[PDB]
Structure 1
Amino acid sequence: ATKAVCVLKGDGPVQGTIHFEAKGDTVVVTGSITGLTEGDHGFHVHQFGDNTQGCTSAGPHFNPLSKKHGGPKDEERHVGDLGNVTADKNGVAIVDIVDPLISLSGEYSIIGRTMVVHEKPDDLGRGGNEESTKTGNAGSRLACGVIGIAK
């Protein structure tokens, strides 16, 4: 698979559609998220594509290599650590990330896993608390969706 799509939804007003496309040895993630409070929101690929208990059953960040929580540009980061998206004043976040770690096939494949958008910004593991090294203190999961194969 070279294209994927995720439809984010939650208990609230956050909603959005993320598109993934494999370009070379990177995956280009695009799309928009709306209903967000202006500012930065933790944006990560969680391990399971299980929406049976809302975004909760998505588990922790996808971390096949058992590293610590980082930001996208770090070497020591979870495969699903894609940092933060930024809602403008209108609550709209435009996603445009290019990641060399997440994949649409193979072991780091995120197909069948969940994209989660958080309440707070991802502190990128530079927070000075244990929590920061586990989730970046991004807090609650506002919206999430299972990543599926797209035409």
Structure 2
Amino acid sequence: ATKAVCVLKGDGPVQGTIHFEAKGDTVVVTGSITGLTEGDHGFHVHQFGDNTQGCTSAGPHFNPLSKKHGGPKDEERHVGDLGNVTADKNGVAIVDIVDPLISLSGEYSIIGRTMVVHEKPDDLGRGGNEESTKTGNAGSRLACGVIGIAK
């Protein structure tokens, strides 16, 4: 598949629609998320597309290469590490990401997995603690959705 989509939903006011398109050896991620507190929010692909227990059942950050957490620009990062999305004063974040590691096909495809937007900013593994190199201290999962094949 060359296109994918994900509708984010949660137990709070946060919602959004994320679009994915394969371009060359990258995936262009677009869309928007609303209902967020002003500022940065961690944005990652989690391993399982399992919504049986809210966003908790999505598991850890997608990490097929068994690396530590990092920012999208780092060599040492989880495949699912897409950094931060930024919400304005009105709580709207416009997603504009081009990533070379996530894919929509092959062993490390994100189709069927989960997109999660977090409570706090992702410190990109530069927080000086063991949680920084695991989750980026992004906090709780505000909303998530299973990534599906799009027309």
Q: 1:108 Cα shift?
A: 1.2
TM-score (norm 2): 1.00
Q: 1:17 Cα shift?
A: 0.1
**RMSD over aligned Cα atoms:** 0.3
Name structure 2 gaps, 5 residues minimum: none
Name the SS of the counterpart of 1:104 in structure 2.
coil
| Offset from partner CA, 1:7-57 (integer Å, 9 cap, x none) | 000000000000000001000000000000000000000000000000000
Name structure 1 gaps, 5 residues minimum: none
| Offset from partner CA, 1:91-114 (integer Å, 9 cap, x none) | 000001000000000011000000
| Offset from partner CA, 1:101-151 (integer Å, 9 cap, x none) | 000000110000000000000000000110000000000000000000000
Name the SS of the counterpart of 1:117 in structure 2.
strand
Give the 5 Å matches for 1:1-151: 1-151=1-151
Whole-angstrom distance in 2 between the partners of 1:134 and 1:66? 11
Whole-angstrom distance in 2 between the partners of 1:149 and 1:44? 18
Whole-angstrom distance in 1 between the partners of 2:67 and 2:33? 28
Whole-angstrom distance in 1 between the partners of 2:90 and 2:24? 34
Q: 1:58 Cα shift?
A: 0.2
Name the SS of the counterpart of 2:132 in structure 1.
helix
| Offset from partner CA, 1:59-103 (integer Å, 9 cap, x none) | 000000000000000000000000000000000000010000000
Structure 1 ranges of 4+ moved more than 6 A: none
Whole-angstrom distance in 2 between the partners of 1:44 and 1:98? 13
Whole-angstrom distance in 2 between the partners of 1:146 and 1:109? 13
Paired residues, number: 151
Whole-angstrom distance in 1 between the partners of 2:60 and 2:87? 23
Whole-angstrom distance in 1 between the partners of 2:54 and 2:31? 22
Name the SS of the counterpart of 2:48 in structure 1.
coil
TM-score (norm 1): 1.00
